[PDB]
């Protein structure tokens, strides 16, 4: 069992990790890597972007960079983009590799 | 100006919002809506997923057309350096402030 810092190194290597002390069942987090897209892709191709964002991009622009980030497979089976580490998650040492 | 609760209502309506008290300049946040995807598409047609996750989906749903995985809505930030951050989070000060404004 490991610290949050070790779990973050395993996430950057592509593993799934979880805390034993979480309330929800069968959950895990994983990392999604950075991506860089031409601005035309963003305005015409990328799904799930608001029109207001797309207009700002068109108005202010080569390439747009999406930073890497963490995600969660939740207890209900949903995927949450943008998982949050609580105070307890960050300071705990009950992290485990789950895949 | 507005409370975070009002900013959240405008985000759900498709607006861009920002706090006047943020340190970085020219920033804003926006909402990306929930989506529902077929599980076969998650295994081979979605970029930016690790193999370990694709393997998990393949093991727990299989080669299925009917089966779908729901991605919930979430907030994103256009940062000070121009990068886009999927999964913006609200600090204590963000949550309790009343200096929110609409930017678009
Ligand atoms: N000891 C604790 N300290 C700080 N916050 C805690 C907490 N216990 C629960 N919470 C939070 O309060 C809400 C309901 O919690 P739960 O639904 O019971 O969450 P859980 O299944 O334990 O998953 C854990 C994941 O949920 C998120 O934090 C939750 C979630 O916002 C965060 O991303 C975490 O990694």
């Amino acid at each position: 069992s490991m610290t949050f810092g070790q779990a973050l190194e395993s996430l950057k290597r592509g593993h799934l990790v979880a805390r034993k002390g979480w309330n929800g069942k069968g959950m895990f987090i994983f990392m999604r890597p950075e991506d860089s897209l031409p601005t035309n892709m963003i305005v015409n191709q990328v799904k799930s972007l608001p029109e207001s964002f797309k207009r700002w991009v068109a108005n202010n622009h080569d390439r747009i960079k999406f930073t890497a980030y963490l995600c969660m497979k939740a207890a209900d089976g949903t995927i949450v983009n943008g998982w949050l580490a609580s105070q307890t998650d960050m300071l705990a040492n009950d992290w485990v590799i789950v895949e």
Side-chain angles (χ1 to χ4, degrees), chain A residues 71-90:
Chain A
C71 292
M72 177 180 241
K73 182 253 146 210
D76 66 353
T78 65
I79 308 295
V80 177
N81 285 288
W83 169 84
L84 153 80
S86 71
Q87 302 304 321
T88 311
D89 298 326
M90 292 187 283

